[PDB]
Subunit: 213 residues, 4 copies
C-alpha cells in the first residue's frame, strides 16, 4: 500500500507485526470472532491502551522537511532518515497548489504565490549547486536550501503511539500538510487493524477530521 | 520456538517483525548478502544502533515474580502481565534445586534448603486459600504469597533494546535466574537475526556468558 | 515534606526543578515570548483545557518512597520515569511488612473476624521472615533466601518524574479502580504536587484529571 | 544564569538544574551518603561499570538558540523534553547563521571564502524578503515560511537528565558530528562540568567515547 500526498510525497507500508488479534492475545496473555472484537471495544472504551502496543508498523515516508520536523516530535517511535553524508540525494520541493490558499483573502492571486515559492526554491537550489561546484562542503552548502525540500524516512511505531499521532495530527488544529499525511496513515491503519481502528474512532479518538472523512 | 526455563518457566516466541534485512533497509532508507552483512557490522562497530530498532519481537514469558521485577525495569519495551483481577490463576512456585546451591559453603545439606523453601511456600499458599475461602478480597489475600510465585507476561521489544537487555542480563553480574532467561532470549534472537546477533557478539556485546555458549 | 502512608510506608520529597512558571516559559517560546500572574496563571489553565501537555515536562520531582513490593510492582509499570531501588539481592532485609488494619476489610462479608484476618497475615509473615533469617545464617546466598518473603515486604526507592508523567500517574492511581493501597500513595504524591505547583495542580483537577478521588479528598 | 554564545548569533543558556553529583550517590546507595572521598570514589565506580541509572536523577533545563539544521539533528534525541518557537504561529525575525570565512579553512575553494559567505547572505536575504512579502499579501505564516532556509535560527527549551546528556555528548561532542553541533555540544559539556564536576570528570576518564572534549 502506497498513498501519494502533496505534489511529490508519499506514505507506504513497509511491514507490520500482527493485526487486531495481537492486541487480543496480549490482553489475555494467551498465545493459543465476536468475543474478540468485543474485547477490543472494551479495552478501547475503558482506556486500556497497553495491549495495542503489541501491534507495530513500519512506514516509508517522503515529506518536506517542515512536515518531518513536526512528525519527528513524536518521540515514542523509531526513525531513520536520508542524509546527504551517506547517499547522494534527489532534490525536489513542495510547491503548494493554488487551492491551498483558497479560503484566505490574499492581495496577490494564489497562482502568483505558487510562482514566488517556485522561484525562490529554484534560486536557492542553484546557489547550493554553485557552492558545491566551487568546493564548498555539502554540510555547509546545504544550509541555503529551503524548508520545503523533500526528505525520506522510515518510521516504526506501535498502534498506541500511532493512535496518539492520529489524535494530534488528524485534527484541524494541526497544519494542513501533516493532516494529509495523517489521513494516509489512518487509511493504512484501518486496512490492517479494522477492529482497532473502528473502536478507536468510536471511543477514543480526540480529533475531528477522521469523523468528517 | 519455546524454551523451558527453571522448574516451570518458559520463553515462547509469539511474533517477529522483520529480520536482518529490515535493519539494512531502514539504514539505507530503501538483497546483497556480503555488502548487507558488512553494513550490519559497520553499524554495530560504530555504534549506529537506530537501524536495529526496526526489528521487533513479541515473547510470551513465564517467570517468578522476583525475576519479572528485574525484567520489568527495562522500560524501552511493552508489557502485559496476568492479574488475578481478570483471570483466575494457577499458583505455581519456583523451588530451587539442590544444585542451585552448588559450591556455596552451607551448614545444612542443599536438599534440606529445598525442603524448607517448599514448606514455607506451601504454608503461605494454604493461608492464601484460607483467606480467600473466608471472603477476604483477592487483592488483599495475595499479599502473603512469596516472591517465587510464577507470573506470565507478553513482552514486545525491538532489537536495540533487546541487545541492551542481553548486555546486562546475559552476564555473570545478573542474578543466575534471569541469566537463564536471557540465554533463551539470545537463542531465539540468534535464530531470527543471525547476522545481527553475530555482529553484536563481535563488536558490541559487553557481557561474559554469550561468547562461552 | 514527608507523608506517612499505610503502617510503615511514606512518600518524601527529595528535590524539585521548576514551578508553575517553568511551564509558562516553555509554552510561550512558541509565540516568541513571562507576562504577569493573571495572564500566566490563565495560560496554565488554557494549556490544561486544550491538552497542551509538553510544557509540563519541564517541571520535575524526585521522591523517596517506602512501600510494599505489591505496590511497587504496580508503580514501576510507569516507564516514563527513573527509579533506583533497595536490592534484596545485595542487602539484608529488615523486618518490615505491611499488615493491613481490620478496617481495610470494611465493606466485605467475611466468615472470619477482620482482626483474625489481620493476625493470620502476621503469622505467615513471621514464619516466612524466620525462615529467611535461618537460610541466611546457614550461608544461603541472600538473593535465593529472599524468595520466600511475601509480597507485603517493604522496599524503598527513589523516583524522578516530570509533571506530565506524574499527572498520568495521578489519573491512573488516584482513582477508585486502582488498588486501595496505591491510592493512598497517589494522594500523598498529589498533596506534594499541589504544594509546589498550585496553579498546575488546580487547573489539572479542573480540566484534565480523569480519576475520581482527588476531586473530593 | 550560565550563558555561552555559539556561532554568530546562537547561544546555550542554563535555565534550571535539579541535583548535583551527590544526587546520583544518594540514588545508587539505596541498593545497599558517607564522606567526600568514598562518595567521589562511588561516582567513578558507577561510571566505570556502566551503572548509569543513578545519573538520571540529575536534571537540566537549557534555553537554546540554534539554526534549524542544528536543531534537526539535536531533536533526534528522544529521551528529553522540548518546546520550540513556532513558524506556524509567530512572525520570524531576520536571524540567520552566516558562516565566517574561517569555516572553510582547509577546503580548497574556487571562490574566495569571503564570497561564499556573501553568496549565503544574499540567498537568505532574498528568501527572507520573499517570506515577508507573502505575509504582507495575507498568506498564512505556516505556508509563507516554507521558503526560508535551514540556517534560520530557532529557539527552544530542552530538559534532559545527565544520563541522556552523556549520550548526547558521546555523539555530538565528537569529530564525526557536524562542526556546528559540536560547538553547541562543547557548550553543554562546559555547563555539565560546572554543575557536576565529579560526574563529568568520571565520564571523561571512563565512559566518554568521543574525541574533542580531550
Ligand atoms: C496542533 C499542534 C501545535 C503544536 N505546536 C507546538 C509548538 O508551538 N511548539 C512545540 O515545541 N511543539 C508543538 N507541538 C508539538 C507537541 O508539543 C508534541 O511535541 C507533539 O505533538 C508530540 O506529542 P507527544 O509528546 O504526545 O508524542 P510522543 O513524543 O510520541 O509521546 C507519546 C506519549 O508518551 C508520553 N511521553 C513521551 N515522552 C515523554 C516525556 N519525556 N515525559 C512525559 N511524557 C512523555 C506522553 O504521554 C505522550 O503523549 C504541536 C503539536 C500540535 C499537534
Ligand atoms: C547486575 C544488575 C544489578 C542491578 N541492581 C539494581 C539495584 O540494585 N537497584 C536498582 O534500582 N536497579 C538495579 N538494576 C536495574 C538497572 O539499574 C536498570 O534499571 C536495568 O538494567 C534497565 O536498564 P536500562 O535503563 O538500560 O534499560 P531500559 O530502561 O530498557 O532503557 C534502555 C535505554 O534507554 C535509555 N533510557 C530509557 N529511559 C531513560 C531515562 N528516563 N533517562 C535516560 N535514559 C533512558 C538508556 O540509554 C537505556 O540504556 C540492576 C541491573 C543489573 C543488570
Ligand atoms: C486499574 C489498573 C489495572 C491494571 N491492570 C493491569 C493488568 O491486569 N495487567 C498489566 O500488565 N498491567 C495492568 N495495569 C498497568 C497498565 O497497563 C500500565 O502498565 C500502567 O498503568 C502504566 O500506564 P502507562 O503506560 O500510561 O504509563 P507509562 O509507562 O509511564 O507511560 C506514560 C505514557 O507514555 C506513553 N508510552 C510509554 N511507553 C510507550 C510505548 N512503549 N508505546 C506506546 N506508548 C508509550 C503512553 O502515552 C503512556 O500513557 C493496570 C493499571 C491500572 C491503573
Ligand atoms: C555522526 C552522526 C550521524 C548520523 N547520521 C544519521 C543518518 O544518516 N540518518 C538518521 O536518521 N540519523 C542519523 N543520526 C542520528 C542518530 O541515528 C540518532 O537518532 C541520534 O544520534 C540520537 O541518538 P539516540 O537514539 O542514542 O538518542 P535518544 O533518542 O535520546 O535515545 C537515548 C537512548 O535511549 C535508547 N532508546 C531511545 N528510544 C529508543 C527506542 N525507541 N528503541 C530502543 N532504544 C531506544 C537508546 O539506548 C538510546 O541510546 C546521526 C547521528 C550522528 C551523531
Ligand atoms: O503544528 C505544529 C507546530 C509546531 N510543531 C513543533 C515542530 C517543531 O519542533 C516546532 C516548530 O514547528 P513549526 O510551527 O515551525 O512548524 O514545534 C509541531 O510539531 N506541530
Ligand atoms: O540484578 C538486579 C538487582 C536489582 N534489580 C532491580 C529490580 C528491582 O526493582 C530492584 C531490587 O531487586 P532485587 O535485588 O531485590 O532482586 O532493583 C535488577 O533489575 N537486577
Ligand atoms: O491495579 C493494578 C493491577 C495490575 N497492575 C499490573 C502490575 C503487575 O505488572 C500486573 C499484576 O499486578 P497485580 O494485579 O498482581 O497487582 O499488572 C497494575 O499496575 N495495577
Ligand atoms: O550528523 C548527523 C547527520 C544526520 N543526522 C540525522 C538528522 C536528520 O534526521 C537526518 C539527516 O540530517 P542531515 O544529514 O541532513 O543533517 O539524519 C544527525 O542527527 N546528525
Amino acid at each position: 500500500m502506497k498513498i501519494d500526498i502533496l505534489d511529490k510525497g508519499f506514505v507506504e507500508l513497509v511491514d507490520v507485526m500482527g493485526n487486531d488479534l495481537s492486541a487480543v492475545r496480549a490482553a489475555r496473555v494467551s498465545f493459543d470472532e465476536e468475543r474478540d472484537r468485543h474485547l477490543i471495544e472494551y479495552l478501547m472504551k475503558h482506556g486500556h491502551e497497553t495491549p495495542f502496543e503489541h501491534i507495530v508498523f513500519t512506514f516509508h515516508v517522503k515529506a518536506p522537511i517542515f512536515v518531518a520536523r513536526q512528525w519527528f516530535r513524536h518521540r515514542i517511535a523509531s526513525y531513520n532518515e536520508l542524509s546527504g553524508a551517506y547517499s547522494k540525494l534527489s532534490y525536489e520541493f513542495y510547491i503548494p497548489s493554488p487551492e491551498r490558499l483558497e479560503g484566505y483573502k490574499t492581495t496577490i492571486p494564489p497562482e502568483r504565490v505558487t510562482e514566488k515559492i517556485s522561484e525562490i526554491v529554484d534560486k536557492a537550489y542553484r546557489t547550493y549547486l554553485e557552492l558545491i561546484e566551487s568546493g564548498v562542503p555539502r554540510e555547509v552548502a546545504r544550509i541555503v536550501l529551503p524548508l520545503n525540500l523533500y526528505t525520506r524516512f522510515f518510521w516504526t511505531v506501535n498502534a498506541r503511539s500511532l493512535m496518539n499521532f492520529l489524535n494530534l495530527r488528524a485534527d484541524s488544529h494541526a497544519q494542513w500538510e501533516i493532516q494529509q499525511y495523517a489521513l494516509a496513515i489512518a487509511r493504512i491503519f484501518k486496512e490492517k487493524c479494522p477492529w482497532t481502528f473502528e473502536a478507536f474512532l468510536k471511543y477514543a479518538y480526540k480529533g475531528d477530521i477522521l469523523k468528517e472523512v
